[PDB]
Every structure is written in structure tokens, then in C-alpha cells.
Amino acid sequence: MSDYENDDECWSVLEGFRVTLTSVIDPSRITPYLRQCKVLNPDDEEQVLSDPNLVIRKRKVGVLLDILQRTGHKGYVAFLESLELYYPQLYKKVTGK
């Protein structure tokens, strides 16, 4: 019998590093993995890939944190899984305070 923390407190850890997430963690990097876990819709996928090479992408990462908060508990675990494969250094950096 174990209780879970609220979605806001879960993402409060990662979003505290928003300036680093928006720079290193591209949504166009982990688009297939996020949509495979259903935490990213085909709508949000098309949206992200509409600005995949542009500087606009960085803004859209910060906006995407809100979208992933709407799926908060599933989105948090799936995003940690995405980073553990693609950016394992930054994954263990943002968890390791």
C-alpha cells in the first residue's frame, strides 16, 4: 500500500530545470517514443515537427511541459524513459540534485 505524489509536484522537479530542458531535450528527438506511450498526441507530434530545426522548438519545449502536465503521471514516467535512452547524462543530472 503506497501513495503517489500529485502531477504538479512530479513535474516541479524537471520543470525547475526548464532553461536546460528547452536547450538540450528536443521534443523532435523523442516524438516517436512519446506518442508510442500516448503522452504525445498526433496533433502535438505534427505541431512539434512543424518547427523541428527552428529556434521556435525551444519555446515549444516549455509549452510542451504544460501539455505533458495534462497527462502528468503517465507523461512524467514516459519522459524519464525517453531521457534514460536519448539523454541519460542529463536524465541522471536533473534527478541528481
Residues placed in the known binding site for Zn(2+): 3, 10, 73
* Vertex 31: Cα angle to 29 and 37 (nearest 5): 130
Q: Binding site: what residues are annotated?
A: 3, 10, 73
- Alpha helical stretches, state H, 37-71: 42-50, 56-70
Report which of 72, 69, 85, 68 is spatially closest to residue 33, judged by C-alpha positions. 85
